[PDB]
Structures are given as structure tokens and as C-alpha cells.
């Protein structure tokens, strides 16, 4: 998270780290057994680390669970990154509580202007790699579909939304993919793509989770 | 990759009217060894390199 603050303690209980030998993505816990994430984070045999504080030391809460089914969205386009959404089913159900807790799915999409919380363990530096040990948080508003489309001409689909600061300085970054974008206690978007990090006039792009609520719900009920 | 003006964009190149350039466009994953680079020097949007460059 380029230009963020340490979340500290545990205020992002629904956060999870996708490991494949090392951390490579984040994800949100939708409920005991399922984890939503960026379809481009898909990898063969992912291991989910929940209730993490420091992704290197055993900070009390330590839960490494293997993923049973890693269901990628059936229309995700690896090129356009449209429909960048994937559901993960944990081999074993995660232990819900005050530590690890699920985040709620939205019922209606966030109107532009809404202030959200993006979080992750991705790179902090704009230029150069400085991957943090602790979870970083970033308050950021949802930009207008217009400023979004203008920044990334045509590339911005109906399943994408821009969030951050057009000025730059604060934005999600490599290692933050699949992470949560919570607005008013709901999961609104998944950290997806953008140009570099915190670059002026190049806001972070995120997956519009509200458009996938149905799919999410059906997938869980059948698998 | 795309035919472009008098030239032809290969692998990781994006076509700019008449010239093929690289992009800083990337998904936000964490490649252990960074993004994979084509023979032209560009890095692919969201594909990681299998070994340090």
C-alpha cells in the first residue's frame, strides 16, 4: 500500500494472505469457508494465512489453511482484466471470532465519493520495492466513473472502478492484489490493476464486487 | 502484440498510432522475480519472470 498507515492491532480481521511459498496476494474472508479474491491471483495450490499481523512472525493469530476449490470467474479475461474475481474454498472452515471475522457482501454499489478502506502487505514505495511486514491501511474515496475512464481510456469496464487520489502519493501496489476495498462495512472492490503506484492521474483500479454478488452467492451454495 | 502503422508490436508492446511502446500497466501481484520481459525489453502486464534478470 503506497503511502499508507500501519493498521496495527487488528481492525482488518477479514484480511487474508494468499501464500504460494511466499506472499503474493491478499483476499477477503466472506465466511468461515470461503475467501474472495482477484482472479489473476489464481495459482495452483494456494494456502491461505488468516488473522495475520506480521506475515513473517507468529503474531498470536496464525492460520495456514490449504484451498480445496479455487473457482475463477468464467469470463475473467486475462488480457483486459475484466471480471477479475475468484472464489477460494478453504479445505477446512476458518475459525470465526473477534480475531478472524468475515466481511459483508454489498447489496448496492457505492456511489462515487464514498470513503473506503483498502488494505494489504504489498509494496509501500512508489519507486523501488519495500515490502512491509505489517498490514498497511489506506483510506481512499471512490472516484467518478468519468475521472476513471478518462485516466484509462476505454479500458475501464462496468466491472471496474477507480479509487485513490488523482494527485497521487497514496494508492495500492504490487502485492496488494486481491485485497479488500471495504466501504461502510461492505466489500466493494478487489485491488486489481493500475499504472505503477500512486502515480499522478493514474488511480488504482478495482473490481466492482457489487456486480458479482449473485455469482458469489450461487457459487457458494453449489460448491 | 498488434500490427501498428509501419511497424508491428510484439509480445509486451502496446501500439501508439504508428510506434510500438512498452507500458507501465501492471496487475498488482507480487512476482518473486519481477515481471517477465519480452525480447524488446518491455515487461508483460501481468506475468512474472521465472528467474532473476
Curated annotation (Swiss-Prot), chain A:
- The residues listed in the UniProt record as binding substrate, with positions renumbered to this chain, are 171-172, 174-175, 177
- For the Peptidase S1 domain, which residue ranges apply? 1-221
InterPro entries (UniProt xref): Peptidase_S1_PA, Peptidase_S1_PA_chymotrypsin, Peptidase_S1A, Serine_Proteases_S1, Trypsin_dom, TRYPSIN_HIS, TRYPSIN_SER
Query: GO molecular function of the protein, one example?
Result: serpin family protein binding
**PTM per Swiss-Prot/TrEMBL:** Subsequent cleavage after Lys-125 leads to alpha-trypsin. Further cleavage after Lys-170 yields pseudotrypsin. A cleavage may also occur after Arg-99. Not sulfated on tyrosine residue(s).
- Give the GO biological process terms: digestion; proteolysis
| Active site, renumbered | 40, 84, 177
Task: Quote the tissue specificity entry.
Answer: Synthesized in the acinar cells of the pancreas.
Record keywords, A-Z: Calcium, Digestion, Disulfide bond, Hydrolase, Metal-binding, Protease, Secreted, Serine protease, Signal, Zymogen
Q: Which CDD domains match?
A: Tryp_SPc
User: Which residues does Ca(2+) bind?
Assistant: 52, 54, 57, 62
Q: How is the cofactor bound?
A: Binds 1 Ca(2+) ion per subunit.
Q: Catalysed reaction(s)?
A: Preferential cleavage: Arg-|-Xaa, Lys-|-Xaa
Among SMART domains, the record links this protein to:
Tryp_SPc
Q: Name one GO cellular component term.
A: extracellular space
Origin superkingdom: Eukaryota
Instruction: Describe how its activity is regulated.
Output: Is inhibited by scorpion cyclotide trypsin inhibitor TopI1.
* EC code: 3.4.21.4
Q: Which SUPFAM superfamilies match?
A: Trypsin-like serine proteases
Q: Which cysteines are joined by disulfide bonds?
A: 7-137, 25-41, 109-210, 116-183, 148-162, 173-197
Which cofactors are named for this entry? Ca(2+)
> Subunit notes for this chain?
Interacts with SERPINA1.
The UniProt entry's sequence similarity note says: Belongs to the peptidase S1 family.
Q: What protein name applies here? A: Serine protease 1
Q: Which organism is it from?
A: Bos taurus
Q: What is the lineage of its organism?
A: Eukaryota, Metazoa, Chordata, Craniata, Vertebrata
Amino acid at each position: 500500500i503506497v503511502g499508507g498507515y500501519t493498521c496495527g492491532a487488528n481492525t482488518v480481521p477479514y484480511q487474508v494472505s494468499l501464500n504460494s511459498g511466499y506472499h503474493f496476494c491478499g483476499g477477503s474472508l466472506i465466511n468461515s469457508q470461503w475467501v474472495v479474491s482477484a482472479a489473476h491471483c489464481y495459482k495452483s495450490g494456494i494456502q491461505v494465512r488468516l488473522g495475520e499481523d506480521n506475515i513473517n512472525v507468529v503474531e498470536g493469530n496464525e492460520q495456514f489453511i490449504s484451498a480445496s476449490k479455487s473457482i475463477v470467474h468464467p469470463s475473467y479475461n486475462s488480457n483486459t482484466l475484466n471480471n477479475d474475481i475468484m472464489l477460494i474454498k478453504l479445505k477446512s472452515a476458518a475459525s470465526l471470532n473477534s480475531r478472524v471475522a468475515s466481511i459483508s457482501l454489498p447489496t448496492s454499489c457505492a456511489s462515487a465519493g464514498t470513503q473506503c478502506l483498502i488494505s494489504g502487505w504489498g509494496n509501500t514505495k512508489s519507486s523501488g520495492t519495500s515490502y512491509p511486514d505489517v498490514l498497511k491501511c489506506l483510506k481512499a474515496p471512490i472516484l467518478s466513473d468519468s475521472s476513471c475512464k478518462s485516466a484509462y481510456p476505454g479500458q475501464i469496464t462496468s466491472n471496474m472502478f477507480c479509487a485513490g487520489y488523482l494527485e497521487g502519493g497514496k494508492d495500492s501496489c504490487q502485492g496488494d492484489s486481491g485485497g479488500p476495498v471495504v466501504c461502510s462495512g461492505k466489500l466493494q472492490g478487489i485491488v486489481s490493476w493500475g499504472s505503477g503506484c500512486a502515480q499522478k492521474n493514474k488511480p488504482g483500479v478495482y473490481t466492482k464486487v457489487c456486480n458479482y454478488v449473485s455469482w458469489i452467492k450461487q457459487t457458494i451454495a453449489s460448491n | 502484440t498488434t500490427p501498428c502503422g509501419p511497424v508491428t508490436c510484439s509480445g509486451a508492446q502496446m501500439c501508439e498510432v504508428d510506434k510500438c511502446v512498452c507500458s507501465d500497466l501492471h496487475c498488482k501481484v507480487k512476482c518473486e522475480h519481477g515481471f517477465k520481459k519480452d525480447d524488446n525489453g518491455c515487461e508483460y502486464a501481468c506475468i512474472c519472470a521465472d528467474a532473476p534478470q
